[PDB]
Amino acid sequence: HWGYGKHNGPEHWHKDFPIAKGERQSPVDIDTHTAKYDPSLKPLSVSYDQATSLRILNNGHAFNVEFDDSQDKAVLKGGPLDGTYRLIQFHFHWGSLDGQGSEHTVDKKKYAAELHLVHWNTKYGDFGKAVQQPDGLAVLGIFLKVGSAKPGLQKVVDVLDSIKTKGKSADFTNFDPRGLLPESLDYWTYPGSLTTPPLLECVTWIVLKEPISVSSEQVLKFRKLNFNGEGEPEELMVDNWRPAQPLKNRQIKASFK
Ligand SMILES: [Zn+2]
């Protein structure tokens, strides 16, 4: 099956998922000088006050913090979006070392990690229907750099020991994702894809300019997770990022001057 190794990593995914070589693949390098300021772009509206987290899952490629998406409780709108997108899950991508781990890059800079808050367009009714549409998802991407601790991340860090291996889940209620946001909601946006199989071209990407800081100890705990299942040979869950893909016929727009 697909993964992040020599024999099953990103350079192999096109064999099972030919859209890997498509016209709107993610992630991309954000060339800050070429991104055009678009005064028509609206402020992002992040409404997470009623978010209901339920569970955290090690799915063998990352860990997902899952939300109740059976009502408009945690929604993204505005920015480049038409209509309302409901939060379903967030997860991260990270490196074996602090000098790599992000999926998007900024003028070729790689951050230590990248947070993806995944939302689906309510006009398609369910996540599974939304991923079949070119405007089905909105993913809010936030870079992580290593420095000061992020206090709002620590509850996530401390549950990871309970989901070390693939297929383990734990109850994870009352987690407030507002504690993972930077101060500024300035962003870049472009049309792209899921960054893991099935690589569907269904995402409006919204990548925040301002990173969050996490401590070395916080990211070190991400790197103790395992790709393998319990009682299998230990393979540390590190370098679970897809590198930048060709921009092709796309424009990256900036919300800010
Ligand atoms: Zn992701």
mmCIF file of N, CA, C and O and ligand atoms in Angstrom, residues 91 93 103 116 195, ligand 1:
data_model
loop_
_atom_site.group_PDB
_atom_site.id
_atom_site.type_symbol
_atom_site.label_atom_id
_atom_site.label_comp_id
_atom_site.label_asym_id
_atom_site.label_seq_id
_atom_site.Cartn_x
_atom_site.Cartn_y
_atom_site.Cartn_z
ATOM 1 N N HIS A 91 -5.113 17.366 11.113
ATOM 2 C CA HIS A 91 -3.931 16.511 11.250
ATOM 3 C C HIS A 91 -2.712 17.352 10.897
ATOM 4 O O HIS A 91 -2.841 18.494 10.451
ATOM 5 N N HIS A 93 1.521 17.144 9.175
ATOM 6 C CA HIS A 93 2.640 16.501 8.475
ATOM 7 C C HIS A 93 3.916 17.040 9.105
ATOM 8 O O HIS A 93 3.973 18.240 9.418
ATOM 9 N N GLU A 103 4.538 20.561 3.888
ATOM 10 C CA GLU A 103 4.146 20.169 2.510
ATOM 11 C C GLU A 103 4.278 21.376 1.600
ATOM 12 O O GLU A 103 5.067 21.375 0.647
ATOM 13 N N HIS A 116 -3.142 20.886 8.969
ATOM 14 C CA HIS A 116 -4.234 20.933 7.997
ATOM 15 C C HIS A 116 -5.569 20.797 8.719
ATOM 16 O O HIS A 116 -5.840 19.733 9.288
ATOM 17 N N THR A 195 -3.348 15.958 -0.446
ATOM 18 C CA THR A 195 -1.900 15.672 -0.543
ATOM 19 C C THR A 195 -1.567 14.223 -0.225
ATOM 20 O O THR A 195 -0.367 13.871 -0.258
HETATM 21 ZN ZN ZN B 1 -2.690 17.036 5.226
#
